[PDB]
Amino acid sequence: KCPVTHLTTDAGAPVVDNQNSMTAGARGPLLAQDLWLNEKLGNFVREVIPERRMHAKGSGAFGTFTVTHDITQYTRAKLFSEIGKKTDIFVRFSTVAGERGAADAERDIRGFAMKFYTEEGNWDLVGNNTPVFFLRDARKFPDLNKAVKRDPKTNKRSATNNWDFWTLLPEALHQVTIVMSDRGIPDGYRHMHGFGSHTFSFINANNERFWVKFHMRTQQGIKNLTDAEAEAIIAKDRESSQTDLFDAIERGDFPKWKMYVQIMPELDAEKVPYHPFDLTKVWPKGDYPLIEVGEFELNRNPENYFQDVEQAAFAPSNLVPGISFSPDRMLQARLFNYADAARYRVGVNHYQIPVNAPRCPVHSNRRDGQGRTDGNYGALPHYEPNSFSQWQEQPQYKEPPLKISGAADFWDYREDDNDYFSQPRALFNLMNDQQKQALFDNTAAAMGDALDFIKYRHIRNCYACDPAYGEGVAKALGMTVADAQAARATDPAQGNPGLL
Amino acid sequence: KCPVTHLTTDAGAPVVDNQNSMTAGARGPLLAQDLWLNEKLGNFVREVIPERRMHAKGSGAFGTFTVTHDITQYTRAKLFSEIGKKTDIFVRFSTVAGERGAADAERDIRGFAMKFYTEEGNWDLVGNNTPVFFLRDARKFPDLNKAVKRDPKTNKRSATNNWDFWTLLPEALHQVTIVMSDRGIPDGYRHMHGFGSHTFSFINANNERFWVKFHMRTQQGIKNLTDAEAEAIIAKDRESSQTDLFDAIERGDFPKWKMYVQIMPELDAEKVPYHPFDLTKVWPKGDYPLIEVGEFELNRNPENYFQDVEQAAFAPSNLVPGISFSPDRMLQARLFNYADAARYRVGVNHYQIPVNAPRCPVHSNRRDGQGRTDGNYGALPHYEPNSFSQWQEQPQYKEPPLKISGAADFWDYREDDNDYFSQPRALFNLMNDQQKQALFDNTAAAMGDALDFIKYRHIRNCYACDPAYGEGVAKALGMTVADAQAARATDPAQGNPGLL
Amino acid sequence: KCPVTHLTTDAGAPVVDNQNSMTAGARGPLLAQDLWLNEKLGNFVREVIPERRMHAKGSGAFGTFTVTHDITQYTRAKLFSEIGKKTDIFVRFSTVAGERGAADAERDIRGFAMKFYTEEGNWDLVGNNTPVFFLRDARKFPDLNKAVKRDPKTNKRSATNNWDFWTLLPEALHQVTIVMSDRGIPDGYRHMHGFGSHTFSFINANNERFWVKFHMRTQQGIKNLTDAEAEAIIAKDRESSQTDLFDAIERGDFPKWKMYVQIMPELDAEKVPYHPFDLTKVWPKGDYPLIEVGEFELNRNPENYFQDVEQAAFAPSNLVPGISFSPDRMLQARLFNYADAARYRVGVNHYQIPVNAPRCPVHSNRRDGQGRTDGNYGALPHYEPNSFSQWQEQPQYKEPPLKISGAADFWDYREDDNDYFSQPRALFNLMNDQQKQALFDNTAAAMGDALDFIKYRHIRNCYACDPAYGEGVAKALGMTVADAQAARATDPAQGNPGLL
Amino acid sequence: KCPVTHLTTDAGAPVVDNQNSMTAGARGPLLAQDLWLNEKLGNFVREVIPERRMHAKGSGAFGTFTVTHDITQYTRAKLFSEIGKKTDIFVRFSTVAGERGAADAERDIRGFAMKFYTEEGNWDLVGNNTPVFFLRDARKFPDLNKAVKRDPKTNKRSATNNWDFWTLLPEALHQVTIVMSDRGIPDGYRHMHGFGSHTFSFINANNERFWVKFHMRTQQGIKNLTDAEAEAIIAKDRESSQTDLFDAIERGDFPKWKMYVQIMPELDAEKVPYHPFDLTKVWPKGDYPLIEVGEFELNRNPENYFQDVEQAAFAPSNLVPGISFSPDRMLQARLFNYADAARYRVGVNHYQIPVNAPRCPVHSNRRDGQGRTDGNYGALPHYEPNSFSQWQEQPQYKEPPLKISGAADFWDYREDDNDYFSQPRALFNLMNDQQKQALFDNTAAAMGDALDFIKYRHIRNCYACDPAYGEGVAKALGMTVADAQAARATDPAQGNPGLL
Ligand code: HEM
Ligand SMILES: [Cl-]
Ligand SMILES: [Cl-]
């Protein structure tokens, strides 16, 4: 609004008429020489890009992060180098299974994706509102996509597809318990925590490695919706979380999180009794307590949703000196899969998009590609080694070596670690009676019409985790643990390693 | 299900392990030589194509059309040539404003897109569940897209954007009245009519032209949902119309429509008192009664939604001998905009997709393009004229000339026809008291929080159509027609041709 | 060169090693966590975009245009408004049939594409080094593409495909004569003229229309290569024209053209004895003498060929107030085909590319699309009509109406005008004996191994144009006009309108 | 040719006129309702896909491979299982640096890409006409692309860019010597050998590993062109190798190669004095003599070049049971980079293209993607694990583990192996005096105008390889080894590990 604008073509030619097309007489046929119509409609049918293969529905905001505590003994990362140091951030929150138009207030994981515009590169912490995940090997990620999304023929969610998959992965019971708890539907993005979920690494100025987990704790408090409350909100508003977050920032009610880390010296990874790189497992806070780092707030709604939120590309591979990866098998796949997904979805030149662009010096020698806008590194020599001091590597940032034991092979995770249930059993025993009844009710509702052998399989897995959990679930499904047990002999998945 | 399948790569190499990735020791980093993971994940992030720029949410089915009546005196079209002749069809139903994930049971137009696999080409009748539309010049179609979709900043529907646009187009009141009536929310695709909406042409074996309108009348009966009933269905099911249609076909309860035509001899177009090519106007049935043609049923759910429904491309330009276009200015733009939209969305080689492919001989000499699969017309000479009898034109199908009067220019539609209100006034006076109260209630709900000057503008336009319509709307908005009238002097759109 | 650069990722993270990949031991397998390699190679395989479907091989330069003469009585175009007024330009020269790597010094038309960065929009004059073309209806343009390019099976140029097509278009003899003359191989882009070829329109401040032809005459002089001289240059340099033009600008030897116009009052188009919109015909200079307008020089080599030359998009539709189109049937197709070609080749957001961007105000309300970088018109309302003074049309630039006579139909060009030979006969009689012998020799060489019936057909067409032309061609082919004449009875194209 | 064809649209509608466009009167403007023109031209501008980022210029043929010898003790690969067993193949030959249009007879490596349509998957042996390459780590491959292709500003080959890069890689001297020898320009694809170049692996039925090198030896004899002979061929024909190969097959003169292998037991890789996975090094035939396997002939020209040759996608990752990879660092990158390059260039669904499609059972569960044609695995469950025997892994094909020693790190190749010159010195001493003089002449011609410090650097590296080689090169450049030696002190690349 405000300053009057006069319509032009892309090339800046004045548009004469924006109400009438050019015709051979007043009621005659349309002419090809109606240039503005050709341009207006040709561009119109190319506005849509592919949605994200996962986490398609989302809301974004800009904000800042402030260091409140010193952790420079563990990490040389420049954004953490001093108390008081402020870094600008972009955050996209999301659901997982919904397409672009889907309801915000579904029972699902939420995405918690953070981009930090640092002096030594953008650092993407691509997190979830849960410290764990259903899977611990990336082999299973495309299968999870199909299981939680639409059947190839009914084009609807399928409790049978979803729960057949989940119940054949006993390692999944931890995240299944979390998403079937009261926290499976947060009351908008401001009332949930975030997590890196994976084990990452810190590297200090001494070139020492630590293993690390990020926790982002909501200063607005954990707050949830029951199935019924969510359904009532969806009936009015499929965009309930966008409404909530946009409205909050618009009225100056900026949401805040505190950032903590669990820090584990490199050598401790071979001393702990739990697999320290297993995404289905946390590190107990009694072994590795939270160390406070800083605080971030979201304080600015983007001017244009498509340019800043839809085109936003996060990559776990977007790391900076002093923050690096781990051999978590899931993290390891994400280190390449996001950059690849973004080359397809927003283009090879997607770092030209302002929300993705670095706010520090950049010298990649990336050349050409569709839609090159930014100079294309001009006439500079485009190869290395060269005799012209172009594109010089920076060895001072080299990480210490990472010790390997064992041959290259497909190593059976089930031989390495098969503690599927101790962590979910702990979580069940933390719950009060209401939360337990919610867990049982939410579970039986989600299984809905899944085939009976699948309901029996979940009840068996849940009983193994804790007899009271198996009972509450079996009861809420109107079944018995005895029938669940009797069904194992004829379970059609017989012969299959995740079938216990 | 049924025959056991053994996992291979695209190239047919056996996959050894589909549960574990290849690692440097059991808890070591991931190896690049894990070929199956690279392939599985690289293909995974390229499954999604752009949604349709309009009518993104939809349901599809296969079926057949049977001629029941003789109209060969009006049309030489081969699918109509004999009573009893059966043609196979594909139909996609849709909403308009929803993205891929959006609720089915919104207040919106529904799409009614038909593909007839004819012996002289696929005939697409790309229709709506309404005989008219909001607009009569394609200039305004991209603007309607933005008005009924998401604000560029809030990323939500905007009553202000939507109703500012609508109230500045008095010609739109006809379709606004239809979509705000009880029929703005059909109880699924089986309980709505379809229409070509536009005036088309028939050409008979004598090379005579008729102007024609297609009506497809539901044999299951008009059936609707109130705002409250729709909201309750959405709370359970965003896919309510897919559920309804898929379930009906799956239980053998095949939905049927009867097809009729209004036929107008060419010369009558200059004798009627209404603009006969104006998409905001019908032809009164008293002047041009319905002539029965045939009956179609939908009787087969596609095996794969993506391959048959999501990749389906309709084009109003997909016409056959004996069925052709008119100078309707809206139809005229669609004659090029759909083929162009599909080149971007499903590729230049989209006619290789089975649902789009013709079931008759095809010799286009279309060469190359990404993903060419079908022979590419092999080694045949690829130019015309040639000395080799390749690609010979077919003059026997030539249409009679179309008379033009007037210069090429931007002809102001408002000078040519400005009867905005007589047809909506007729429709209002057909309604019984309940339907009228629904029209008023639905209208005030849809305007929701639109700025007051916009509510005043709709009330003025509605009063001009019929004093009782203006009153019922003003009342349901908690306003008065007097205030509406007083606001015209300061209306901020002053200086603007659609502001009456 | 000069300032030392330190290699980073796109996200600005330092790169540790640019010589060694990350491996599991010194002679072990490659790790997926080698982030720089993934990024470097993933981006590398996306550098290439599609070449132009026509005129793929080219050279570009920046320059300026200066008005030297007053023609404001004929055109209100702002770049021409005063003597001395300077406009910045980009020019791309090209061959036509060569792919990206093909030789510069082939016997072909050359492209002469001009972009003028004007205060009322970019004006593209997309010209050739010839005043005419082979065709006069766009129906035949894709066929010309196939005929002059590679056979679908041999993947080589085919004299049979090329000359079968050409000899079945008698209207083509004019351009065939030009491209087979000594001027079919200019000695680089600096020693050739340019032409708009088509009839365009001027509109003056009085809203009067003139028909207009643009001539751009080389101030370096017409200079050509024989077949033998060209072949010798190709043996050393496939990039001979890039070498020539780049080297000339680099040493300050800036090439200059003078711009002239032929001006014809609107009404004269119905008074001339030649079809004034027929691209196979010029306007004789005796009827419409050249009027001088200005002078342009190319004086700056682009810093980056891909960003400025390969991504350059010209469109005949890029017109400005006071310069517009004509009903030339070929021009009429180009008015839409280039903008469409560019949406595919450089993207819907290709006007963000600096060489394509306007240097004047732009308000198109074009939204979104892949790779949106420039603000996306932020939060401004995105529909018209609106109550907020956004996107207001500009009626002061409206053209006078264009008179139409006749029905909409496929009008046979051969019924309308069939003077195939008078203009080529004039051109043949302008030639001196050497140029004539060149025309005959060049023709027989180009026909090479074309089937005999095709050589006979060219000789017949050439004899009809002028008995001496038919003789010289028949002789250089080692045939006789008598045999050519005897072959017409059995010509396999019998039954075909371009077969005389 | 032969059967008369009648022109239709893609949808199979008859085309009335293919010579005239639809106009408002005979000399009037073009109408938008000319559907055939819209379709014909819209499809026309989408025929071109991106060329290959490397090896863009090529020729293809179909053929067969016959086993002549038993090697089943080394490999369980099914195509080798019996003497007499015939496998169908596709082969694409190429240059490396040329774009689509570039000359065939340039001084360059040639590509020798083989696809074997095997009963357990397509096996791609993506080879070159040389047993080695310039590089031994993939870090340097994009840099080699830029060095051997066009300068970002001159858009021409640059001897300075090319030789600056090459002379700073002493490991490159082996391949530099080969490509500067008489064999740098083979007399077409039929007179050159092929090689896998890399060390691969065989796995036998006992689950034992061997390291292996493939040699494909021409039965038509090594035959070459001098610089002068090549230049003379280019002056006539940029497509000389396509002409040669197509013509040979067309006249029944089918070219044949014999396939041999060098076989090295796994444990020998730690016993040899040369790095056995270093692409700049061969295995001496005295240590590992050639073992004969079979013979292949190319006997069928494809019907359509674009469908079969341009869309052909090879991937080193396309391996079958009994043939696998090695830790060669270059091979390791190609294992992912080709499948990724093809997803961009020919689409995610490129295995639908007949030349790429497997000729054995395929069950990948790859879903959707643009242009899905083939059923999309219909309604089958689309996740694993499932209770429905879909997508079952095949463990019988598991390879033995691969022993790793050392930490994950960037291991400096120059510390591991720095024998740059012994193999090129051997090759120089195999040459007769003519071949030596050719090597010197070809080298000085290729360095052309490269800056002097670069010529000095090549002479130094060549002298180190063999004093006679340094002398012959220095002399042919008109320089002395003494000046070369004196220049090292001021060499501008001082401080750089490949500068000796
Ligand atoms: C100039 C006015 C119009 C323009 C520019 C327009 C443009 C479009 C575009 C670009 C799509 C998506 C096409 C694709 O990607 O396959 C679409 C879909 C559709 N349109 Fe329109 N449209 C217009 C008017 C109408 C009218 C008046 C009706 C009904 C009479 C209509 C019915 C539909 C239907 C049913 C679909 C969905 C087709 C399907 O199921 O794939 N449209 N339109
Ligand atoms: Cl891609
Ligand atoms: Cl496109």
Q: Domain spanning A147-168+420-500: which CATH class is it, in words?
A: mainly alpha
Residue holding tokens 């003089």?
Answer: D437
Q: Which two tokens stand for residue B395?
A: 């003059």
* Cα D55 versus chain centre, distance: 7
Helix axes D227-236, D433-447, angle to 10 degrees: 60
Give the helix ranges, DSSP H, for C257-411.
305, 329-345
Q: Say whether residue D404 is in contact with chain C using an 8 A CB cutoff.
A: yes
- Beta-bridge mates of residue B87: B65
Third-level CATH fold of C58-134+180-356 = Catalase HpII,  Chain A, domain 1 (2.40.180)
Task: Mention every residue, 6+ apart, whose C-beta is less than 8 A from residue D286.
Answer: none
- A349 contact residues in C (CB cutoff 8 A): 371
SS3 category, C6: strand
Q: Closest ligand 1 atom, CA of B195?
A: 30
| Partner chains of D (3+ C-beta pairs under 8 Å) | A, B, C
CB atoms within 10 A of CB D494: 10
Residue of C nearest to B366 (CA): C142
Please, is A415 exposed, middle or buried when counting C-beta atoms within 10 Å of its C-beta (0-12, 13-18, 19+)? Answer: exposed
- State how far residue B329 is from chain D, nearest Cα, in angstroms: 11
Interval between CA B366 and ligand 2 midpoint (Å): 25
Residue burial C246-259, b: 16+ Cβ < 10 Å; e: rest: bebbeeeeebebbb
Q: How far apart are CA C311 and CA C357, in angstroms?
A: 11
Q: Which two tokens stand for residue A451?
A: 């085939």
* Cα B95 versus chain centre, distance: 9
Numbers of helices and strands, H then E, in chain D: 14, 12
Structural domain spans, chain C: 1-47, 58-134+180-356
Q: How far apart are CA A305 and CA A414, in angstroms?
A: 44
Q: Are D423 and D282 in contact (CB under 8 A)?
A: yes
Q: Are D40 and C430 in contact (CB under 8 A)?
A: no
Closest CA to A443 of A212, A141, A180, A243: A180
How many residues belong to chain A?
500
Across the interface, whether the CB atoms of B402 and C385 are under 8 A apart is answered no
- A328 contact residues in B (CB cutoff 8 A): none
Helix, strand, coil % (nearest 5) of chain D? 35, 20, 50
Residue holding tokens 């059923």?
Answer: D375
Task: Mention every residue, 6+ apart, whose C-beta is less than 8 A from residue A252.
Answer: none
- B365 contact residues in D (CB cutoff 8 A): 7
Q: Are B397 and D14 in contact (CB under 8 A)?
A: yes
Q: How far apart are CA A289 and CA A282, in angstroms?
A: 12
**Which residue is closest in CA terms to ligand 1's atom 13?**
B338
Ligand nearest to the CA of A45: 1
Q: Which of A315, A318, A371 sits opposite C349 (nearest CB)?
A: A371
Closest CA to D44 of C134, C338, C124: C338
Q: How far apart are CA D245 and CA D190, in angstroms?
A: 7
CB atoms within 10 A of CB C289: 11
Question: Of D128, D161, D349, D442, which is the active-site residue?
Answer: D128
Terminal-to-terminal C-alpha distance of chain C: 64
- C234 contact residues in D (CB cutoff 8 A): 234-235, 238
Amino acid at B442: N
Interval between CA B335 and ligand 1 midpoint (Å): 10
Terminal-to-terminal C-alpha distance of chain A: 64
Q: How far apart are CA C397 and CA C410, in angstroms?
A: 32
Q: Are A95 and A110 in contact (CB under 8 A)?
A: yes
Q: Say whether residue A430 is in contact with chain B using an 8 A CB cutoff.
A: no
Q: How far apart are CA C386 and CA C382, in angstroms?
A: 9
Q: How far apart are CA D272 and CA D264, in angstroms?
A: 10
Q: Are A314 and A126 in contact (CB under 8 A)?
A: yes
Residues in D 274-333 with any Cβ partner in C closer than 8 A:
275, 277, 301-306, 309, 327, 329, 332-333
**Residue D128: active-site member:** yes
| Residue C463: its H or E element | helix C452-465
* Cα A413 versus chain centre, distance: 24
Closest CA to B33 of C28, C77, D395: C28
Q: DSSP letter for C14, please.
A: B
Q: DSSP letter for C396, please.
A: G
User: Which residues in chain D precede a discontinuity of more than 2.5 Å between C and N?
Assistant: none
Closest CA to C404 of A283, B411, B486, B109: B411
Residue burial D83-99, b: 16+ Cβ < 10 Å; e: rest: eeeebebbbbbbbbbbb
Cα atoms found within 13 Å of the Cα of residue D185, Cβ hemisphere only: 20
DSSP β-ladder status, A86-94 and A194-195: unpaired
Question: Of C128, C162, C337, C442, which is the active-site residue?
Answer: C128
- Beta-bridge mates of residue B125: B114
Best mutation target among C387, C394, C458 (most B Cβ atoms within 10 Å) is C387
Binding-site residues of C for NADP(+): 174, 181, 183, 193, 215, 217, 283, 285, 423
Q: Which of A1, A12, A404 sits opposite C122 (nearest CB)?
A: A12
Closest CA to B487 of B449, B460, B465: B460
Ligand nearest to the CA of B278: 1
| E-assigned strand segments in D20-108 | 22-24, 58-67, 86-94
Third-level CATH fold of A58-134+185-356 = Catalase HpII,  Chain A, domain 1 (2.40.180)
Q: How far apart are CA C385 and CA C367, in angstroms?
A: 17
DSSP per-residue codes, A70-113? --TTT---GGGSSTT-EEEEEEEEE-SS--TTS-SSSSS--EEE
What Cα–Cα distance (Å) separates residue A467 from each residue in A181, A437, A471, B284, D153?
Answer: 18, 15, 6, 72, 73
Q: Say whether residue C374 is in contact with chain B using an 8 A CB cutoff.
A: no
Q: Are D125 and A365 in contact (CB under 8 A)?
A: no
Task: Mention every residue, 6+ apart, whose C-beta is less than 8 A from residue A370.
Answer: A347, A348, A349, C46, C49, C346, C347, C370, C371
SS3 category, C17: coil
**Which residue is closest in CA terms to ligand 1's atom 21?**
B54
| Residue D471: its H or E element | helix D467-476
DSSP per-residue codes, C22-75? EEESTTSPBBTT-HHHHHHHHHHTT---PPPSS--SEEEEEEEEEE-S--TTT-
Q: How far apart are CA A401 and CA D11, in angstroms?
A: 62
Please, is B119 exposed, middle or buried when counting C-beta atoms within 10 Å of its C-beta (0-12, 13-18, 19+)? Answer: middle
- State how far residue B419 is from chain A, nearest Cα, in angstroms: 16
Please, is D159 exposed, middle or buried when counting C-beta atoms within 10 Å of its C-beta (0-12, 13-18, 19+)? Answer: middle
Query: What is the maximum span of chain A, computed from C-alpha positions, in angstroms?
Result: 86
Closest CA to D201 of D399, D31, D465: D399
Q: How far apart are CA C99 and CA C53, in angstroms?
A: 9
- A407 contact residues in D (CB cutoff 8 A): 401-404
3-state SS track over chain B: CCCCCECECCCCCECCCCCCCEEECCCCCEECCCHHHHHHHHHHCCCCCCCCCCCCCEEEEEEEEEECCCCCCCCCCHHHCCCCCEEEEEEEEECCCCCCCCCCCCCCCCEEEEEEEECCEEEEEEEECCCCCCCCCHHHHHHHHHHHCECCCCCCECHHHHHHHHHCCHHHHHHHHHHHCHHHCECCHHHCCEECCCCEEEECCCCCEEEEEEEEEECCCCCECCHHHHHHHHHHCCCHHHHHHHHHHHCCCCCEEEEEEEEEEHHHHHCCCCCCCCCCCCCCCCCCCCEEEEEEEEEECCCCHHHHHHCCCCCCCCCCCCEECCCCHHHHHHHHHHHHHHHHHCCCCHHHCHHHCCCCCCCCCCCCCCCCCCCCCCCCCCCCCCCCCCCECCHHHCCCCECCCCCEEECCHHHHCCCCCHHHHHHHHHCCHHHHHHHHHHHHHHHCCCCHHHHHHHHHHHHHHCHHHHHHHHHHCCCCHHHHHHHCCCCCCCCCCCCC
Residue of D nearest to A143 (CA): D383
Q: Say whether residue C391 is in contact with chain A using an 8 A CB cutoff.
A: yes
> What residues flank ion ligand 2 with Cβ within 5 A?
A 343-344; D 344
Q: Which two tokens stand for residue C372?
A: 């949106």
Best mutation target among D7, D20, D307 (most C Cβ atoms within 10 Å) is D20
Closest CA to D319 of B11, B39, B37: B11
Across the interface, whether the CB atoms of D415 and C26 are under 8 A apart is answered yes
Across the interface, whether the CB atoms of D41 and C333 are under 8 A apart is answered yes
Residue holding tokens 């010589």?
Answer: C19
Give the helix ranges, DSSP H, for D62-150.
141-148
Third-level CATH fold of C1-47 = Cytochrome C Oxidase; Chain J (4.10.91)
Closest CA to B33 of D318, D136, D336, C26: D336
Find the Cα–Cα–Cα–Cα dihedral B11, B17, B19, B21, rounded to 10°.
-80
- Beta-bridge mates of residue A217: A258
CB atoms within 10 A of CB A449: 8
- State how far residue C304 is from chain B, nearest Cα, in angstroms: 28
Closest CA to D220 of D250, D193, D183: D193
Q: DSSP letter for A333, please.
A: H
Q: Which of C1, C8, C317 sits opposite A364 (nearest CB)?
A: C8
DSSP per-residue codes, D202-215? EE-TT--EEEEEEE
**Which residue is closest in CA terms to ligand 1's atom 40?**
B92
Residues in B 33-72 with any Cβ partner in C closer than 8 A:
33-34
Q: Are A30 and B337 in contact (CB under 8 A)?
A: no
Q: Are A389 and C5 in contact (CB under 8 A)?
A: yes
Q: How far apart are CA D282 and CA D277, in angstroms?
A: 9
Across the interface, whether the CB atoms of C46 and A380 are under 8 A apart is answered no
| E-assigned strand segments in A277-322 | 291-300
* Domain made up of D148-168+420-500: CATH architecture: Up-down Bundle (1.20)
3-state SS track over C347-371: CCCHHHCHHHCCCCCCCCCCCCCCC
SS3 category, D216: strand
Cα atoms found within 13 Å of the Cα of residue B93, Cβ hemisphere only: 28
What are φ and ψ of residue C235, in 5° steps?
A: -55, -35
How many residues belong to chain B?
500
Residue holding tokens 């002749």?
Answer: B85
List the catalytic residues of A. 55, 128
Q: DSSP letter for C392, please.
A: B
Residue holding tokens 């399948």?
Answer: B5
Interval between CA B344 and ligand 3 midpoint (Å): 4
Task: Mention every residue, 6+ apart, whose C-beta is less than 8 A from residue D252.
Answer: none
- Beta-bridge mates of residue B62: B90, B300
Please, is A207 exposed, middle or buried when counting C-beta atoms within 10 Å of its C-beta (0-12, 13-18, 19+)? Answer: exposed
Q: How far apart are CA D467 and CA D484, in angstroms?
A: 13
- D11 contact residues in B (CB cutoff 8 A): 121-122, 124, 315, 318, 351, 358, 362
Domain D58-134+183-356 grouped into CATH 3.50.50.60: no
Best mutation target among D386, D410, D454 (most A Cβ atoms within 10 Å) is D386
**Reported resolution, Å:** 2.2
Task: Pick from B140, B338, B346, B356 the residue to mutate for probing ligand 1's pocket: most ligand atoms within 8 Å of its CB.
Answer: B338
Residue holding tokens 């300075």?
Answer: D160
What are φ and ψ of residue C483, in 5° steps?
A: -65, -40
Q: Are C183 and C225 in contact (CB under 8 A)?
A: no
Q: Closest ligand 1 atom, CA of B312?
A: 41
Q: Are A368 and B65 in contact (CB under 8 A)?
A: no
Q: How far apart are CA C400 and CA B368, in angstroms?
A: 43
Q: Are C490 and C455 in contact (CB under 8 A)?
A: no
Q: Are C187 and C221 in contact (CB under 8 A)?
A: no
Closest CA to C105 of C220, C245, C229: C229
Residue holding tokens 């002061």?
Answer: C396
Helix axes B141-148, B329-345, angle to 10 degrees: 70
3-state SS track over C150-219: ECCCCCCECHHHHHHHHHCCHHHHHHHHHHHCHHHCECCHHHCCEECCCCEEEECCCCCEEEEEEEEEEC
Q: Are B131 and B196 in contact (CB under 8 A)?
A: no
Q: Domain spanning B137-168+420-500: which CATH class is it, in words?
A: mainly alpha
Q: Closest ligand 1 atom, CA of B60?
A: 40
Q: How far apart are CA C373 and CA C371, in angstroms?
A: 6
Q: Which two tokens stand for residue D148?
A: 């051997």
| Partner chains of C (3+ C-beta pairs under 8 Å) | A, B, D
Closest CA to D21 of D37, D43, D45: D37
What Cα–Cα distance (Å) separates residue B489 from each residue in B164, B457, B495?
Answer: 17, 11, 11
**Residue D376: active-site member:** no
SS3 category, D14: strand
Closest CA to A38 of C328, D44, C383, B336: B336
Q: Which of left, alpha, beta for D365 (phi over 0: left; psi -120 to 50: alpha)?
A: left
Vertex A366 angle, CA A361 and A372, to 5°: 95
The pocket around ligand 1, CB under 6 angstroms, is made up of A 41, 45; B 52-55, 58, 92, 94, 111, 113, 126-128, 133, 138, 141, 197, 279, 312-314, 330, 333-334, 337-338, 341-342, 345
Please, is A300 exposed, middle or buried when counting C-beta atoms within 10 Å of its C-beta (0-12, 13-18, 19+)? Answer: middle
Q: DSSP letter for C308, please.
A: I
Q: Are D335 and C41 in contact (CB under 8 A)?
A: no
Find the Cα–Cα–Cα–Cα dihedral B358, B362, B364, B368, rounded to 10°.
70
Residue of C nearest to D236 (CA): C231
